[PDB]
């Protein structure tokens, strides 16, 4: 399995949720879409937990 399915649950606690597909070790996928219960654009976040390909956090502060 290369591309897995996930459940994005609305942040405005309606219960509304949208499902999308991602690569197995993709970053946490949050997106702003229309919640029809609330009748506005709200944040969606992943309901379940899963492991991620850990990227090194690129440093803008010039280290050393």
């Amino acid at each position: 399995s290369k591309n897995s399915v996930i459940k994005l649950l609305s942040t405005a606690a309606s219960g509304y949720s949208r499902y999308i597909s991602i690569k197995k070790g993709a970053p946490l996928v949050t997106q702003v879409r229309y919640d029809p219960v609330v009748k506005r654009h709200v944040l969606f976040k992943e309901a379940k937990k899963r492991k991620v390909a850990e990227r090194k956090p690129l440093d803008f502060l010039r280290t050393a």
């Binding site: 690129l58 440093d59 803008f60 010039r62």
Partner: protein
């Protein structure tokens, strides 16, 4: 294997805010082989330079106007033409 300097996140130059690279430059006097001085802008900090080998003493740039040297130095008392005439019998070849 490939030796590199790994890049940091690039700094966003905004459109319109880009400024031209005006490097720090000193006015430098070059005295050539002869006494002709010329001013040139230069990044290295030296107000005056005098040059030894230039176009103004090269034969290619003015046609109208060191083993050998070592040899000359260490066979100077003898003074080494007359010498050629003495040591040039053309029978044997």
């Amino acid at each position: 294997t490939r030796i590199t300097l790994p890049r940091r996140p690039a700094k966003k130059i905004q459109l319109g805010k880009s400024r031209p690279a005006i490097y720090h430059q000193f006015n430098v006097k070059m005295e050539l082989s002869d006494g002709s001085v010329v001013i040139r802008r230069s990044q290295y900090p030296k107000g005056e330079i005098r040059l030894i080998q230039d176009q103004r003493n090269n034969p290619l740039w003015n046609p109208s106007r060191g083993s050998l040297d070592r040899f000359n130095k260490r066979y100077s008392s003898l003074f080494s033409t007359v010498e050629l005439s003495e040591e040039n019998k053309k029978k044997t070849q």
